[PDB]
Structures are given as structure tokens and as C-alpha cells.
């Protein structure tokens, strides 16, 4: 996020980091319950990647984080990689996440829910802060 | 790449108004936000865009794509969850 700010540690409990086997963070994701994570289909996740929950400072070694294995990757069949439409993938965890003060789920809307233009919302992540 | 988790508030745009920036690239299963002085960027993809509804944070978008240079004056494009939640529901119910 460019021009964002540091979050209060643990205040976005559903936020997870997708890291490859080398420990490199390449995408974010959100826990919707103890066994499932929602992410973007274009992130190209594989079962060799790891879901990290409860993390704030990726540079700290003293945080009690949960490194979870991925059992299966469910890429939305409607995903169109040419137009990047329907960019959603579901990850089923091999081991359920342990919900706590710093690890919990975000709510999902109803298909008919309305979010008007002009509404201020929030986005979080460990993406570049400067290009 | 920041070690610590970042956050940013930003406004939702209408797809019609978003087409003024991206044209036909904007589909029905996409929702734009930003062009407000902040921007999601590489590494943020797959992450959440949440809006508070009735006291609870709801997943409205999934960071998808945007300006190649993460320009803060251009809106970011997110996967529109309301258009994809039925599939999420079917997938969990069957697995």
C-alpha cells in the first residue's frame, strides 16, 4: 500500500500472508473460517505455498504465528486470466487455524448486499509502499 | 516491501465512473476503490478490502489489479465479492 500507515498489531485478524517455500511473501489473503482462506486466483497459489496467520512484523522472530499447510486449491472456474475477471481462489487448509485474539474471520456479504460509491472502506497488506 | 502490516482507508467508486479511467477493462465482477491519495500495490494482491456494515467488517473486495506504477490518483481494481459469494458458498458446502 502506497501512502498507507502502520496498522495496530493484530487489529486485522483475518489478514494472512501467502509465502512460498523460501519464505518470500507474494500475496495476501483473508480467513473466512478456521479451514478456509480467500485470495486472488491470479496469485497462482500451489500446495507447496504456506498460509501465515497472526503475523504483524514479518521481520520479527518473537511473534506467535501460525504457519498453515494448504490441502487443496480451488480456483473459480469462471476466472478469466485474459481479462482478470472473477479473480478469486479458495484455499482449504490441511490444518485448521487456531482462532484467538489475533486470528479470526472476516464476514462475507450477501449477494444482494449494496455498497454505495463514496463509502469509505479499508484495505490492508504487506505490498510495496513505494514503486 | 514493508515488514509491518500497512492499512489505508479509501472510497468506493461506481463502475461507470471507474470506466473513465480503465474503460472496457472493468467488468461486472470488479469493483474500484482509491484514486484518493493512496493505492494498493504489488504484494497486496489477494488481500482484503473491507467495509463496516452493521458494526462488522465485511469483505467487499479482493485486491486484484491497478496502475502499473501504483499511482495514487488512479483507482485500484478489486474482485467484487458480492458477485462471487454464491460460488464461495457452493464450494464450502460441497467440500
Amino acid at each position: 500500500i502506497v501512502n498507507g500507515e502502520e496498522a495496530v498489531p493484530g487489529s486485522w485478524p483475518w489478514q494472512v500472508s501467502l509465502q512460498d517455500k523460501t519464505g518470500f511473501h507474494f500475496c495476501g489473503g483473508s480467513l473466512i473460517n478456521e479451514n478456509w482462506v480467500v485470495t486472488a486466483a491470479h496469485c497462482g497459489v500451489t500446495t507447496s505455498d504456506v498460509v501465515v496467520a497472526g503475523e504483524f512484523d514479518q521481520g520479527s522472530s518473537s511473534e506467535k504465528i501460525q504457519k498453515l499447510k494448504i490441502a487443496k486449491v480451488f480456483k473459480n472456474s469462471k476466472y478469466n486470466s485474459l481479462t482478470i475477471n472473477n479473480d478469486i481462489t479458495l484455499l482449504k487448509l490441511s490444518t485448521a487455524a487456531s482462532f484467538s485474539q489475533t486470528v479470526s474471520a472476516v464476514c462475507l456479504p450477501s449477494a444482494s448486499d449494496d455498497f454505495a460509491a463514496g463509502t469509505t472502506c479499508v484495505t490492508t497488506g504487506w505490498g510495496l509502499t513505494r514503486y | 516491501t514493508p515488514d509491518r502490516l500497512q492499512q489505508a482507508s479509501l472510497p468506493l467508486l461506481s463502475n461507470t465512473n471507474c470506466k473513465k479511467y480503465w474503460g472496457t477493462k472493468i467488468k461486472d465482477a470488479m469493483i474500484c476503490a482509491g484514486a484518493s491519495g493512496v493505492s494498493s500495490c504489488m504484494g497486496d494482491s489477494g488481500g482484503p478490502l473491507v467495509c463496516k456494515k452493521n458494526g462488522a467488517w465485511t469483505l467487499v473486495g479482493i485486491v486484484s489489479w491497478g496502475s502499473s506504477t501504483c499511482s495514487t490518483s488512479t483507482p485500484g481494481v478489486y474482485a467484487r465479492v458480492t458477485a462471487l459469494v454464491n460460488w464461495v458458498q457452493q464450494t464450502l458446502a460441497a467440500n
Partner: peptide
């Protein structure tokens, strides 16, 4: 869902 135990500050 959607209610963090540690409230975010924006």
C-alpha cells in the same frame, strides 16, 4: 465474524 478483539485505529 468481522469483529476484531483488538480494535483497529485508523
Amino acid at each position: 465474524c468481522g469483529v476484531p478483539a483488538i480494535q483497529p485505529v485508523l
